Amino acid sequence: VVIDPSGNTYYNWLFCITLPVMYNWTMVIARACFDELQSDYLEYWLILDYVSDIVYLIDMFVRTRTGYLEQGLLVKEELKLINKYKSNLQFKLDVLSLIPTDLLYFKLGWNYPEIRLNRLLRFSRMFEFFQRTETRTNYPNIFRISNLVMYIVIIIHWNACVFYSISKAIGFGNDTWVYPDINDPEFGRLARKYVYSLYWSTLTLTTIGETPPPVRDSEYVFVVVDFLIGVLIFATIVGNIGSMISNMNAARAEFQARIDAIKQYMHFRNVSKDMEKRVIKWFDYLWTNKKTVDEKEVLKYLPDKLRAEIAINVHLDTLKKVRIFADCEAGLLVELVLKLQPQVYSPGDYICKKGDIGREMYIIKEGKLAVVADDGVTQFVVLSDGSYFGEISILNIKGSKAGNRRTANIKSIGYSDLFCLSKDDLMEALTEYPDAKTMLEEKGKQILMK
Amino acid sequence: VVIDPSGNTYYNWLFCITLPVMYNWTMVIARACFDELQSDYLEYWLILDYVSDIVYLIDMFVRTRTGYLEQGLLVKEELKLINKYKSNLQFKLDVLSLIPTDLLYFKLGWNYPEIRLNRLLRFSRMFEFFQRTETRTNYPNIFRISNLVMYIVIIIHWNACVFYSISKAIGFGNDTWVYPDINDPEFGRLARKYVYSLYWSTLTLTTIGETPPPVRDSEYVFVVVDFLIGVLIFATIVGNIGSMISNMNAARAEFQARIDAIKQYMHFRNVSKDMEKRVIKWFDYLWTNKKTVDEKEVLKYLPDKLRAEIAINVHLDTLKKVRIFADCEAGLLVELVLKLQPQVYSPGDYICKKGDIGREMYIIKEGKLAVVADDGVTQFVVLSDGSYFGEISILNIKGSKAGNRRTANIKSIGYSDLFCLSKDDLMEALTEYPDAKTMLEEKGKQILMK
Amino acid sequence: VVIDPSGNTYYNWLFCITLPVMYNWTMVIARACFDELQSDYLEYWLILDYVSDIVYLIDMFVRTRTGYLEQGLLVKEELKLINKYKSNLQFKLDVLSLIPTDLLYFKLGWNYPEIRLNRLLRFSRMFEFFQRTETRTNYPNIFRISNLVMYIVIIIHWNACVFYSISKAIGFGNDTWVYPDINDPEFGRLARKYVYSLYWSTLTLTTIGETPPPVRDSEYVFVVVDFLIGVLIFATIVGNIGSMISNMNAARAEFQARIDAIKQYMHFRNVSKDMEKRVIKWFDYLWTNKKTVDEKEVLKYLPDKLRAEIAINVHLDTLKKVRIFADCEAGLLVELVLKLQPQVYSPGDYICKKGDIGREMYIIKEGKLAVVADDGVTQFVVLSDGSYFGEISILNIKGSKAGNRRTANIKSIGYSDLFCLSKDDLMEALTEYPDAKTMLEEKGKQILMK
Amino acid sequence: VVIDPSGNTYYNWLFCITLPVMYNWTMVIARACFDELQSDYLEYWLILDYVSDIVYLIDMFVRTRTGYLEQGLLVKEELKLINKYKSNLQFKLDVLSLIPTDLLYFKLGWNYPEIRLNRLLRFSRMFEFFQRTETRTNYPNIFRISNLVMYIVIIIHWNACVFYSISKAIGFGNDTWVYPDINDPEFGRLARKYVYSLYWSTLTLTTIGETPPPVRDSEYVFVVVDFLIGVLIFATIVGNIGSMISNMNAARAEFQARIDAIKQYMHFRNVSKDMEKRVIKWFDYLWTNKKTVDEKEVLKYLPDKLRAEIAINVHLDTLKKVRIFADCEAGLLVELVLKLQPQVYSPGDYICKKGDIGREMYIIKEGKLAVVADDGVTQFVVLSDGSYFGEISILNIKGSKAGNRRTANIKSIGYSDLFCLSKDDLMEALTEYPDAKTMLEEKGKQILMK
Ligand SMILES: CC(C)CCC[C@@H](C)[C@H]1CC[C@H]2[C@@H]3CC=C4C[C@@H](O)CC[C@]4(C)[C@H]3CC[C@]12C
Numbered sequence A, B, C, D: 001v002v003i004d005p006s007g008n009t010y011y012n013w014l015f016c017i018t019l020p021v022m023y024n025w026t027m028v029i030a031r032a033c034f035d036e037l038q039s040d041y042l043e044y045w046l047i048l049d050y051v052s053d054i055v056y057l058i059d060m061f062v063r064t065r066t067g068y069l070e071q072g073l074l075v076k077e078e079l080k081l082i083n084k085y086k087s088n089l090q091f092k093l094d095v096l097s098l099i100p101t102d103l104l105y106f107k108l109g110w111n112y113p114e115i116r117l118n119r120l121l122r123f124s125r126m127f128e129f130f131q132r133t134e135t136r137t138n139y140p141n142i143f144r145i146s147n148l149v150m151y152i153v154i155i156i157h158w159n160a161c162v163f164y165s166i167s168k169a170i171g172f173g174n175d176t177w178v179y180p181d182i183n184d185p186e187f188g189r190l191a192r193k194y195v196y197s198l199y200w201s202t203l204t205l206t207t208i209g210e211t212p213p214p215v216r217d218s219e220y221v222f223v224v225v226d227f228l229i230g231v232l233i234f235a236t237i238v239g240n241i242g243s244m245i246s247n248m249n250a251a252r253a254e255f256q257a258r259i260d261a262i263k264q265y266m267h268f269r270n271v272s273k274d275m276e277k278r279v280i281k282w283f284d285y286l287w288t289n290k291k292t293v294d295e296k297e298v299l300k301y302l303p304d305k306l307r308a309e310i311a312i313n314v315h316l317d318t319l320k321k322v323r324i325f326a327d328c329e330a331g332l333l334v335e336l337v338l339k340l341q342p343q344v345y346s347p348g349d350y351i352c353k354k355g356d357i358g359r360e361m362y363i364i365k366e367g368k369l370a371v372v373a374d375d376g377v378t379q380f381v382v383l384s385d386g387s388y389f390g391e392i393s394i395l396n397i398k399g400s401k402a403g404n405r406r407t408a409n410i411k412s413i414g415y416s417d418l419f420c421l422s423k424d425d426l427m428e429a430l431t432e433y434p435d436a437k438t439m440l441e442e443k444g445k446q447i448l449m450k
């Protein structure tokens, strides 16, 4: 049995192992620096530390059971999985993180949880869980902000622990900069110790600076270094949030850039204000209805097989419904589906006029066309989605009375979204299906002579 | 009767409903936290709250009357509109926002406007009005900054209300951090209460921090959380403004990148300093005159129908004015208009020399050409906009005495902006208009034999 | 006589008129707010104000003499220039800025230079000078930073003047927030007044906040508004500098993105480490020698005429030096120059091997090729820049003994930078020059039969 | 002997010369401003200054020995190298930086190391070492952050030195703003002097501002200027880090933009949820396995020679293994290798079905294909990497019984990564190898008639 590293079980385990990694990264330093926190809840700390070590062991076992992909297949041989694990640097990191340093609790004493700092070497699982969540969630930016806030709170917490440890080393209350005397009823309280240390660290790492100024040299050095770290942290927060904001409205920026370029062209080329407003309305329609992306330039990112599967799933039924293509083989229908070109029209747009060159066949997807008269108001027929026209105009039919010309005025009652099959496209598709070509042309001949 | 959600009436209603949504989002919390604000203007608050509730009801009715687009047409059947509304989550939000919680004024008392916090669930209308304004205004960046400032002021106001409520819960003046005693003549005044709370909130959310430091633990916790919120707010302000600044000068950045790439090529390829200055002057002209965008790569964003309409509206009159195309059918003229290629020239640029291969026909749009002699200074004719030349050089005329060669020196008197119709383009256009082809070639023959 | 708005005279005048616009924008408010500054140097202020008004008059005259571009030519008819000026909004702004408000000095007194605030309506000239400098200087980013600093200093100066005016209106020293008593020997000094106001404004607009806190309500309101303005100013500074930094290393970012994509391909496709290092060295060479931009994709931004002029100026001499093209007409040589394809090679790269298909002709630009033996170390000939080979392999010569195959091993002694003329390119170029084709092929025949 | 300016020796020397440049840039100002630092370690300062001057001399000699690239070859003539050095501005800068100003130690005294400020003119070597490291290291962003921190620490150090010099000029302790009296036991200590000056400079340049406010005017001016410098420094830090963060996740941003565009297309085109999940899984696979970049659009950045070398090194062995191409000449095999098109498939994807048009030949690279029956579960053969099929379907073999159709159902057992050689590609490749074409077709005939 092997875990697919792209499945849900692997992600759930990433969460499960991120829990003790976060617990260690937040609490080992907190118990190392705030001695009362370590010595007053030592029973809970023992339980939680050894549950975390058990979960680390289970993480190593899982990492022996996680199949990597070789020759496009998931490797599921225990020998190969264990070999790829042990050969990896992650195995060394996991072994180091699992090295029993709690045995120093007998020599050093119960006031040294620093020994469990090796548990921090499982950071890879936590970072991997975050990376996987970011590529998995429906809210990538909400999670991105949550992850940024988590990093910032952990850095501020670590810096608070460092401030309290520096105050302890210098001596609580020995000068006005360090944390005050812990023999005071108010500032000797563990909640106060941690919360004032966190307040100090937030003041310093967010470059507010409303803390008692340093007294001693080491304090000046540490406060300088910590102000610089805080400047870098603030710059990183701003950089991350600004990169996220850029990516959030990069689509709108690109769309508005296209709009502005076309406005510039139109105003420069003295396009009439009527057509200028028609173009502005068209782009408003595109943005409002989430059709700003070009179908061709969007499907180009897919592979040929997956793009063909998409095209089939979208077009094959309506293309079979066409009468000429009703009884042609499947490979030809796929070759034709791959050659449909989307043509979107506005309300009142004429798809065809009587006398236009008919070189293309149109299929209606999500639209309503009106066969109208020369006056352009009288609707003979209303062609809805799934319907089509011009299927004879794309056939080379020997002896055609009326050809190469549209005999109807096809108008868009609004936002028709047609899909077009040109004559050259049909010929290129038929170049490998000659019996299909002759059968199609004979069927069109039967249609005409009717 | 149905409202077009892309028209002016819908946008005006978005403003009308954004007014009470903003009123609620700003004033419900302010009256909940500053008790004197609620109890001293309770008559105005009742009037405004119930006008807001009436506008919320009208918003729900409007949302039953707002037509969505189906099959490219605006749905205007009351059954379908009401069904799409009630099925939407927005309907649930509107019902929750309209749930009468003012009835708690009888149980809780007049000092609990918190009950109207459900009115904040109409935020969707306000956000939609902002989104629509951004895509509608001539000043997207001015409105973007105004909207950012509005969000920031509302967040600072909410945080001021939270600070005052925390001071109230802890006790006004009980320590030096909370808002002072409200029994003081100066700090017991409602204007002072709100303005000092707003000052505190601005100091905290903008990471200035010149406030009295926390005394109690909860105050330390809240000040840490509020400093972190303020860091995130500042990072968001910077990210939004920097994204806006990037988008504002992204066109200039792209243009300067092209300029620098061409400068790099020229300096590397040892292009003569004369031509190097000619290229620099050309790009200065492009930028100064708002022609930096490539016409082809700009019109590629349009649909084929709208691009054809643009091309017609720009070129069809000058193309009809041509003598050979004077009496050819309209479909051919559109097919030709779609094949004109813009060619811009600099002052003194030769479009043609005597002996150059004449394979292209030129139409002058916004320019002045000079038919000059071999010396290149004597102007025979001055060809202005609308004029053309080379229309015979694009015809395959059987038995042509002088062909394939230009017989004139056509020079640009400056920034001519020609539109070119090549011979291959005319042939590809005529491939579907054979009688047009034979008539064009016979007309060119009559022109030559003249 | 008419000024070219793209020439040096117009830019020099932009500087000349920006001087009084900057003087007004900085000094009118300073004299309005700091009364001793206005009343102690009133003689210098009169001289400077009226020199500024004279320069504003000369600016209006210049703007009547500035030719706009119509039909690609510079309009230089005084009637048309004056009409385009007076019809413009800039003319209204200039008239308003020149409205004599100094006449109020008789009614209001010498302590009211606020009357000259209309002179600030010439801001367009200053902004235009900055916009022109940015597109003109060799140091766009240095000037960009200087312009940002100028804007920031002017905003801080204006805010300092506003702080001093608010202190004056409330009363100097009436509370601890306003500017102190100006009857003090130290704080009553004009240098102190301005420099402390500027210090206050810098503390507030840069969100440092180390100022005496507000006492009164209006002071709280103003300090809140000024902190928010300062947050927006800081965000704008960061946005501008970050946009500038992005544009500064966008070329390196794009290049490194290409490098990383190719590294990803190579590592994935298991490209041998030898070729992997060859590719890395090639990209290091490209970046180190400023050849990262693709010649084709760089020249595509030029117009056809200017791209042809570049190609001629780069290639025409070496292409004439070729023996087959020695006596062919100029249009054909230009058509061929436009078809040379750059081919860059690395040291030791073989351009041709004995037996390779010879379909292309090579011209050496900035390189050294070695005709070597089959062993590949013995150099028969060393082909330098300007030299060429393969000119027969691109000719269709009837009855060729040895054709379609390279008879030499051409090796690159390092970074050869060849330009290639394929056979298909020569045929496409000759399709319009048939006598050139027959003469070229007969010349190649004479070469072969020799 | 000449140093390659792109080799390891040149980079090592860049480090060696950056050491004394950094030493000068950090210590000359520190000794100039902190007089006890200069006068208490004067022996170490003499040793280090003259070691730095020796290294500057060696840098000038190295710069005479650094070969530039001319005609693609490394210039290694001492005359030309020395000429290009002395003609350069860098030679003038090096001479100025080496001008003996230590001779002023006899006139000015040992308390004036300012004389060595000319040594700062070697900044070019330091900046060049940084630029070279950035384009050389495996950790460009880590080094980028380190270099930013180095610049910031040097600016803060310089500003600390400036603050101490201003305090000295005004007088230590003369007011509450300057550095206090240096006759105090605590603040007269050199460690305290420097560390408090550095603390002051960090407070000021990071816009924290928790320093004693200015007393005198010059102090107000300097503090304003230094706050503005610090605002610019913070904006530059944020801009650099945000540009780095943008470039770090620009690949993920582009990939997610493609994903979102395809999601938009699919949801709009009503693609079935099955295929929608198939596309999402495909993109997850692409990102997880570092194959997000399109092979064609990635290799387009390479030159033709290097792209051909890559293609050969990747494909030539498997292409030779093909039976029809087993004994064809090498130029044809390279022409064919350059025409392989990557086709990646998903588990269960059918590469071919019985009856599909066989126009393409497939080679398996990193995959496993299964020849299956019409039911699609029974595997006849399992085709692994290196294997191929369809090599007859790409040959025009006179008199072929079964052609143009696939006779097998080829299925992907998962992530097959095939490389395709179409029939048109083979024909275009054979157009220059006619004997290869006839031999290939006769070999295919022998295969068929077998
Ligand atoms: C990094 C952040 C998010 C995690 C902070 C964890 C630690 C350091 C903090 C947060 C919760 C805090 C606890 C909150 C409440 C109490 C109860 C109090 O009567 C004694 C201390 C004690 C138990 C605190 C000790 C410090 C503490 C455990």
Ligand SMILES: [K+]
Residues within 6 Å of the ligand: A207, A208, B207, B208, C207, C208, D207, D208
């Ligand atoms: K600050």
Ligand SMILES: [K+]
Residues within 6 Å of the ligand: A208, A209, A210, B208, B209, B210, C208, C209, C210, D208, D209, D210
């Ligand atoms: K502060």
Ligand SMILES: [K+]
Residues within 6 Å of the ligand: A207, A208, A209, B207, B208, B209, C207, C208, C209, D207, D208, D209
């Ligand atoms: K501050």
